[PDB]
């Protein structure tokens, strides 16, 4: 069954055809598209900064989320948790990024903008309405209140958002414990789900950090990193007409040996060319960037030893040098060092929050989301274009008819039943973007804050670096009549 | 000259025909739609709730910003400000509400949903693009900067808007004052613009809570408050289906003296009826809300003492019953006291913050703003349509030009100049909406927070009270294409 | 029956004889002492600097307490308190300085620097021991918990502490309310004590400045202030020697007034002198000075127009001249302004916090603590130095006794009634300085924070200004032995 | 030489002599006294609790501190700093503990408990007086300002007191750097005082908690930790008359290994007994106690797995039982779990912060402070007592001279003589409890905080169970006149 990297693969084992009707005739196939939240003029950017992690080197899936999963599994053993949990196996059908985890009572939420529950999981149980608002009372959350939820945002959050939901599972079912409203009793132990999660929490950190993770990636990129002969040259076109910066969250070490896999073809940006070092595509590279924090104050501007991999002593207070390569510091950083306004970057990142939101809002960044995952739902959301189609006409039946003083009620069944007809074919926890008629959490941040959005930022190169990335001119209601 | 409250008065003036096809007929003509950003079944609202000032107590214009204006430079020229401010006179064709006040340069900005510079006035003079940046590097304000920038979204806030600049004007040009980039400097006095505008902000206050400002209005409610034979029909009609109560900032005998006026009618609901008291109306009854943080810890709740006037003391612990007058508390109060959830509750207010905003993303209540404004908006959005659709098309083709590799740039100047003149339609600080294509931080907040919006919370009126209010799903990008 | 302001008003009375060995005289009857806590040479001061109010305007007792008292129960039963409230009086017998006033149970406390109790009263009757366990399990508070508890720190204070416990008392005994552990319960309306605190402390706030207290102090300043024709004779004396300032947090015409009354003699620094204004005496005049933030960031320097007695618009910025009063600033502006560091500094003030502990720990200043009562207390110290002599009698034999393994019992019981009995020479609410054996925390804050105190700072007057006021070296227990 | 470690193993040694006139002759000289700041009667104690480090096994010096600081020299030259700090060699001559450094300048500071500079070493160069006013122009630091000075306030961190010395001294004198006011600069990097502390600071947590500094420790505990026959003996009668319990800031495996060793004899409390384990010795064991946060808020408690070393999952919720081990908790477990109240506790250690200070002020339990170099200092003192008695005539020389109008000066630095004279008897940074006549901050938190003190723990053996430890009666000054 192909998965989100898989399609991603495919794209990436292509070679550039740069001939200009090519180049329209792929950039209006979807997958290979630039879609446009607000209207950016490419010819105003000077600078193009990356992220890394799930934006240069996307992960195949499912081996990398599995690998994450096995081992956090085996760091939870370690740590003291049951010997059963060793049976679990990660499966990419249950878990969507962006789900809500609440500590308080267990359960994952997919929810929208405002916290109204879309989807109610306890374990594997999918609550259904009624029985939700013995928890939730309004149907909904205060999502704002980050001591009781948490949000999966990120591409690394897919194998603990399946684990947690595989604990509660366990737990709930395994007859040593006796369930409570806010977690699981063994005696006179108590575990709540807001320890469990933080233990989980725990890890993942650790697993990346001070675990195997790194180390068994880069013994086997080829399992576990798709590369793309076209990265090198869409950042020397890049290179052409402004600069290029990295700003990743990644120490040196790791991004170096990443960073060589991508670029480890026989030839430079294009066959025929001498190959290039990496870091010789980028007019700076700066690793350790603590992002969001990096949008604020940041930290402390720091020089990496590039011999050691270690940091030198001090803060480093010179100019833009070539060949050093700068740790923390902040996005005042990249506009000092290259001369640009916030409105003159494009920065292409993965991280809804760490990458888009706090660029665009503090420091207004021209922005571009990579959404790995966009092209299985592109996939989907074109095969069953039918349901959401019933969809609409339901509600359009449903408002005249309430108009007209149980009727209104079996189509309220029905509308209730090809939302899930739909949301069952994306998985389990259902689209990315929605649920049924009802826009996610994650699709209403998209819209606000990445200015541009696409399966992969390489569809950038189907554009011509002039282009103007259009959106239609919002209406308020009372402007349209 | 016609202003907003003016259009709402003339509606004001006409009875209610309640014939079925008059109301339909009525709710098209757009002045009296209620407009519908998200999509809310009127059959499930249990509970109405209500704002008082500039919601239920819709303030004529422009006298009362006119009076409030003369009472605050009496205060200001009261505690030191020179005898020059008293020649100053409110012009209501400047101030446009939602802008926003920079304490550090002394600006009134006209900024987007991102911070983005739509309009600089320094005084009364408009700072243009370059000019712009040697303050506005990036063209752009943080304005979650709450410390250096204050929003002034509220029609109280009009008098205030005009004054601010009308004193940068006055220190500006008088040459016993030397201009700074921060503020003016006589000798060995400097006045900040910060402290200017915390001047500004107290005497405001002041007149509204210890000057003689709620006196001089309630002496001449008829030249001062709009009224509405309409009102005591429409909270009957909303009594039949279910609860109404009032939540409102102002004190008890304020908001008695003022919610007297609004039902003294020689009649109840509808002609021929008796009179009834404003309180028979309203199941609850809460003054000193406390808004916004009514909607989250709230505080103390305590119970009136209508008699006098004063709180009776202690905390009020005991049922909802008849006649009793409830002070402070929260939202939670209400949901108590009803016995209702916060999507139950159609809460209808002008603070787009303290009314909408808060009660949304902290409650989940449903949200009606009422927008006094509109009225006037709506006429010259109408009007002046074409100016906007030529904007739209300008856009079009400045798109279809890049994508052709310095006429880029007349047409830009043509959009410069159809923005320009279309926002002078408004105002010299152009529609509450837009500046030309671009739509305003207040804007994107309606749209985002207020369920439904209109002219005034009366055209509730024109609607069966089981209708649905339906928006059109909302797709991004990828979903269309 | 003489009270402490009455001994204060004798010495006020008596003309100062500056022959060399009537000081000497004079300053070793103790009444006339200055006393050190930690060495200091008056050689090395450069800047006398002052409060005013309980420091250079001693106000009479208890006339002016009464006072304080009566206009605050009449603002409390205005704003809604029963109308028996009126019937009580000012009785001075009942509260000693540096009570802490439990908001959760409604306790008047007397703790040690360690938060011990050493007296517990619930209105009028004392709480003993095991009683005080059911809600001082371990006897003790953590008196930094300044969410719960309110230490009254100010002679300005004696009034609220005297109405707190007439208030607790009158509730605990009407019949119309039920008592609780935290408060008072009549039907549906709960009195919390704290909430009672609450309004006690507003109305006292009240009362100084929006009541009639200040205003009534003016119109008989003979009844309620006490004048001493030695001041200016003091302050020109250390005019000679260094700078003298006044850093006061009343407001220009309050000070205008009291510092006019302190001056007015038929003559200037002694008899037979020129009389001269009050502000002639410094050279430096601050009021509005926020202390304790004084001593921190204080806030913006301003400049009192003294012919209106308002503020000037804008930071004053300019050089120390001639004739200029300065409102709010910071330490700094003193420092700056006089050219002196802290320890250059003697400032001469009766809050043990606001104007001692604060400069002190936070600036490093000298300090000079003024205690009105000290007169008082002096007396009572010596006339019944029998009992503490006892007092110490009996700890030394409990000690040879548990060292020799109900003996230890009647001892203890002894010690608690001459405690007792001591402590009642004071007031219901013991000395100022102890209950018994143990010191009080106002005791142990002397002792740390005020390098000299006295009961006046008129004593001053009897020292040489090159004096050495020199404590005896302080050892360790192990420094000895 | 003979360290302070050296004489608590001399008497470490020697075997109990129970023989009570023995006992009152033994704790009379001044080594084995349990001195006394303020009374407590050890009849009263309940509960007698205890840390570890520092407190029950006293590491040997300066074997330890050495070991320390080869461990943490070697983490920052393999962390980036350079080589030559592998020449460095610790001196124990040069520190004393309670030395504050100043991250802004670089220095280390001896200060009294307001604050007052009685050093200043900038790396070995000690600064004086006037130069002193160039960085501190009033002579004194704000210590509470935790974000500029850290306290070196255990003995733990008397390596890094050196090291930090050592630093600074090499910096400053190594041609490859530049000395800048704030730090160092070696072209484009510079390194702050702030940022190089932060660094040591680290380095020292990573050697003991990821270094080898617990493992070399561990494998030759004979030549790092002290050991007493007496220890079992003393906990033993302690277990008779009430409860003993153990709360440490290590975990389990540490402090199993660290105590196996302290009872490691041939026999149990006394010669001839059976040995038993160290747990047996414990009604309440709690490690990872995370003091002084154990004192306030605390954090879960949780159960060890002593079998493994590792926490079980969960919160333990149970009972005390025999046997258990508990993480975590608050100072709240001790007392629930010993039904005790603050009072009826003793907790003996050696943070005058973490254990004492933090104890007393939040809790009201009774303190007793261990400062295992009290030995050496108490041997010093009694040497030179001649310097201290004419440090006392000189300051009444000095008085007896001011109250007469260049003598006065020949006086001062002969008290500037003496007292560097007395200081030099104790270390290159003087003694732990003062500078000549000036008290340290730390001797003023020791009487403020510790109601008793001693060399060692061990000390209370030499004292009956129903001992009254007297302090004599505090007087304030007028209490004496
Ligand atoms: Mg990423
Ligand atoms: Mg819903
Ligand atoms: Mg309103
Ligand atoms: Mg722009
Ligand atoms: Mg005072
Ligand atoms: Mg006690
Ligand atoms: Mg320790
Ligand atoms: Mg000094």
Not at 240 to 248: I, Q, S, W, Y
Not at 307 to 329: A, E, F, M, R, W
Not at 392 to 399: G, H, K, N, P, R
Not at 402 to 419: A, E, F, G
């Amino acid at each position: 069954s192909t998965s989100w990297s898989d399609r991603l693969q495919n794209a990436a084992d292509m070679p550039a055809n740069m001939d200009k009707h090519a180049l329209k005739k792929y950039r209006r196939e979807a997958y290979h598209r630039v879609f446009v939240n607000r209207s950016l003029a490419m010819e105003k950017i000077k600078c193009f900064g990356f992220d890394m992690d799930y934006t240069l080197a996307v992960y195949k899936s499912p081996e990398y989320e599995s690998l994450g999963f096995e081992l956090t599994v085996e760091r939870l053993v370690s740590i003291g948790y049951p010997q059963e949990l060793l049976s679990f196996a990660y499966d990419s059908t249950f878990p969507t990024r962006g789900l809500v985890f609440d500590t308080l009572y267990g359960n994952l939420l997919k929810v929208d903008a405002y916290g109204n529950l879309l989807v109610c999981a306890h374990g594997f149980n999918f609550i259904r309405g009624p029985e939700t608002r013995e928890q939730y009372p309004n149907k909904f959350i205060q999502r704002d209140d980050t001591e009781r939820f948490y949000i999966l945002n990120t591409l690394f959050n897919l194998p603990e958002t399946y684990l947690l939901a595989c604990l509660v599972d366990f737990f709930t079912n395994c007859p040593r414990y006796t369930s409570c409203e806010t977690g699981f009793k063994d005696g006179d132990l108590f575990m709540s789900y807001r320890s469990m999660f933080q233990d989980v929490r725990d890890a993942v950190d650790w697993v990346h950090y001070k675990g195997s993770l790194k180390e068994k990636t880069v013994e086997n990129l080829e399992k576990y990193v798709v590369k793309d002969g076209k990265l090198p040259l869409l950042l020397s076109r890049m290179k052409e007409v402004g600069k290029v910066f990295l700003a990743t969250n990644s120490d040196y070490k790791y991004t170096d040996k990443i960073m060589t896999y991508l670029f480890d073809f026989p030839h430079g940006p294009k066959p025929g060319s001498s190959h290039r070092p990496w870091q010789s595509y980028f007019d700076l590279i700066l690793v350790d960037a603590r992002k969001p924090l990096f949008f604020g104050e940041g930290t402390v501007l720091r020089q990496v030893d590039t011999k050691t991999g270690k940091l030198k002593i001090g803060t480093y207070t010179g100019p833009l040098q070539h060949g050093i390569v700068y740790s923390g510091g902040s996005s005042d950083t990249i506009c000092d060092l290259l001369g640009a306004k916030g409105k003159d970057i494009l920065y292409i990142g993965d991280h809804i929050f760490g990458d888009i939101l706090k660029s665009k809002k503090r420091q207004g960044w021209r922005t571009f989301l990579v959404i790995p995952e966009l092209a299985q739902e592109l996939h989907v959301w074109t095969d069953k274009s039918s349901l959401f189609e019933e969809l609409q006409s339901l509600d359009i039946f449903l408002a005249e008819l309430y108009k007209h003083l149980p009727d209104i009620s079996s189509i309220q069944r029905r509308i209730k039943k090809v939302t899930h007809d739909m949301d069952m074919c994306y998985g389990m926890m259902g689209s990315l973007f929605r649920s049924g008629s009802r826009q996610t959490l994650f699709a209403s941040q998209v819209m606000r804050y990445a200015d541009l959005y696409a399966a992969s930022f390489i569809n950038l190169l189907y554009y011509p670096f002039s282009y103007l990335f259009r959106a239609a001119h919002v209406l308020m209601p009372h402007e349209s009549t």
